[PDB]
Symmetry: D2
Subunit: 295 residues, 4 copies
């Protein structure tokens, strides 16, 4: 036997960083969860019990803190590039670094119609993430994403015209609730190294804001023919707004809300046009994906 692939590192490293404007007295906090996995010439640690090739996972954790201390942690696409680049340049036998970052929301509180200087609130569980792969001699691959964005529209969603055969019991509908947890990923064109990533810095936050806005507007306005059709429209718009993106990927659960027939109880009418009370279903759920790129 032989080692076909190997990676190791530190997972679930929680990091918080505060920025203090001495001028204005305004404070800004950043909180994230970091994973860093390394690859290189480390086979002997597995095959020969040779630990000399191992950069201890505890040292990797130390390095994340130090890096966060000496560099900006935002935007995450930059911080992740700096962190991955560090491992491949510092260690001769390490040739790839895979860095995953999850940014948690800490939103400035508004007190009395005015932004508070140092108080924050977590508004929802929606995350902004980055996956950065830094490979010696192959540049920097970045995939940015937003996830945990949960939305629902109570009408203007349809589903009819689908295949019908002896396995089908689902009825066609012209009016239904559509609810989902949005997971959207945009993959950037490969970057030659850190200097190139630094040159595109302003595009990261703007592209994140754009993906979010397009996602929300398209969901709210589209008279949805299906989840498939609505998601393609979002992805089409994101690609058209940012040329440096190669592919957009969406992964959407269809969280079902079933009508409850109450007619067995005093002829109570609660179906079709009279539907008011529904039962949200925990499982199972439809799962719909699509990767859209440039023709």
């Amino acid at each position: 036997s032989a080692v076909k692939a190997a990676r190791y590192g530190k997972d679930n490293v929680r990091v918080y960083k505060v920025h203090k404007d001495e001028k204005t007295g305004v404070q800004t906090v950043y909180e994230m969860t970091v994973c860093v996995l390394l690859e290189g010439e480390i086979e002997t640690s597995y095959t020969k019990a040779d630990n000399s090739v191992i950069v201890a996972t505890d040292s990797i954790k130390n390095t994340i803190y130090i890096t966060a201390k000496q560099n900006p942690v935002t935007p995450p696409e930059l911080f992740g590039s700096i962190l991955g680049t560090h491992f491949i340049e510092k260690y001769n036998h390490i040739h790839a670094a895979h860095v995953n970052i999850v940014c948690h929301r800490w939103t400035r509180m508004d007190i009395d119609g005015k932004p508070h200087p140092h108080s924050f609130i977590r508004d929802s569980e929606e995350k902004r993430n980055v996956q950065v792969d830094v490979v010696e001699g192959k540049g920097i691959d970045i995939k940015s994403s937003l996830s945990g964005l949960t939305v629902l529209k109570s009408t203007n969603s349809q589903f009819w015209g689908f295949l019908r055969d002896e396995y089908t019991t689902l009825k066609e509908t012209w009016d239904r609730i559509l609810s989902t947890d949005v997971d959207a990923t945009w993959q950037w064109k490969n970057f030659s190294g850190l200097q190139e990533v630094r040159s595109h810095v302003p595009k990261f936050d703007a592209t994140w804001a754009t993906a979010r806005e397009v996602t929300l507007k398209t969901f709210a306005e589209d008279n949805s023919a299906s989840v498939q059709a609505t998601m393609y429209k979002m992805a089409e718009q994101i690609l058209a707004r940012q040329q440096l993106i190669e592919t957009v990927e969406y992964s959407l659960p269809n969280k079902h809300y079933f009508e409850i027939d109450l007619s067995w109880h005093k002829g109570l009418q609660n179906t079709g046009k009279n539907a008011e009370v529904f039962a949200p279903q925990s499982d199972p759920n439809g799962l719909i994906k699509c990767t859209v790129g440039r023709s």
Copy 2:
């Protein structure tokens, strides 16, 4: 042996209800999770296998749907009173109903600086809850609450002057991060029955908004001497704003963010006044509670 206490019912009943304004075309959704437990003369179901006294848990579930269909589901203190009252009046041998409701947020989306008629987003995992106990001949006891409100302030929090003995290693501090998940409960004065609850309807939503606002403002503005001191101030204000409240209860975790000493690495300064990078701690955590009432 004998049955000293008994209750049974249906838990985790998810309910969704939509309101459609035919005039404006505006839709409003309500989503909640309901638990209903009953008590009464049901001992024989346990002792003698006598199921004749049992209102099937499946029937209790049916009843929640029917009740939601025929009545307003908001404010939750009213819907819960209606639901509990129903069981004790309908069934002769049922003398207490305990109804718990958790309201999930579905917040109208703003598209292009304007409220969307039928699209919603879950902004955070913060809940509004109610506990309603409807006891035959003893009226209606209601406890309302908000939970899952997660906040953090990066400065203006202190902790010094505490007891020091041979078990103490904690250092006094004049500047620290304060973060917590707020769980606040206000207990209403006992109500004689449904007609009395209906008479106070407008006070429910207003008191909920008040508890939230006071909680947020006090946390942000108080130069906190301790979690204990800050929570008492919140509770004091809520009691002063609403006379129909008998007691306010707060339960607050103190989620710790530790300084990271980086001086072993090139004399890097990251403690005290130079602290920028912290390590959020998952556990353990301080847990601080207090019940405040009227003197």
Copy 3:
């Protein structure tokens, strides 16, 4: 306003302890999660920002480690009594200690039909817990419990004869799946202090083993008329086996497995006596409780 009730302390303190037999070379591990909340004369910490009365939560955490170091951590009813007693004797103004302990399973591995000296496996998520309230001048109240015991029987469970009215749609049945997560608590008679608890040490583990065994045997053998009837039988037996127990409490979810009618598909028969494939339901679920004591 005034402080009606107050308690504070440390939650989620994870503790591991290893015992090494120098003779046999056999090692035994104990892992638990501890919560300790204190009460006493601490009102001024809330009302006057007077921290002098506060035993820091960090010190409480230190104390748990020290106590675990100097005393046996098993059985948990003893360790919890020692820990609570410590706070009320050490601090003059602290009059009650509430200690909660959750024991996690680490079960000796069997390698080659033989017990391994120092390797363990977590077999299931079932917990053994204790709640200990140590109140100055009122002795020691202990509630022991087992939870997270998940079981299912595929037949020999019935449910018929229940009340039927206009809210009922559930059909009577003579054969069904019964599945639940067992939560059983036995409350001990009040103890005068530590010396009395020490005198009953051997009864703790034996009573825990007994509750478990009776729970499992009764569930498997009873031709269940209802969850209510089966749980009363368990509680009756536990009370008869241990006189020092005052009350047994059971709290049982009824996790439903619905039949799937497949007759719309080629007359496939999958209901009643032909039922083979079921759909486990995540929610909602029946919740059945009962507290049984001595007549």
Copy 4:
């Protein structure tokens, strides 16, 4: 823009199946969670709102129930092959089916030293899984796995000789606790179709039992030089025992248990050779992976 990749289907389909031996009266239950995602000529559902190409996710759910009704659900590698094969043969425009199955444990209860005919208990949260990809014209790819196997050894684990530089603070050790959650996957050689999978049926369960046993024995007996070294030894043995396996993959977290220095308290000795009380750390954790194949 264009669709580069697309898949859709049903996730979280919970299925239970009971087998009743009319002879012996012995019942056997199987419980699983199934995901099925399809690919084929379905681009137009995204691009043109053409639902005619869509096999409704609800129909996919129906099909899982029907398939489970007409076929054995064990071993899971077979059931998954049958299910995936069904979609590609039945639908002309569907060319790949991806089926994921998670098997939950329901272990026959032993009552009075004897196997009970129809009562079961969930012993741990350990899963047996399968991933089956059925691609038209490319046969059947199966990856089997076990996950959620949580183990700990209190001694006979070392970690010394690792790289040391200015980022290192970790001390070398010759004696430590080693704890992890085992995730092991074995990939089978490609199968030509269902008839070939049926021919190897007996090898599935045996290979699963083998992977488990080797994993447990190697963990318990190896005087571990590192997680890397111990995992390679397991994978080496699995490959040697089953020729039809092409690659073994392990993914192991290193769950840390830190020593607690108690010397600041009365010179209490709790480090190195005197270590008895440890603090289990929730995060961060080391993450170590390796894919081992044939030379």
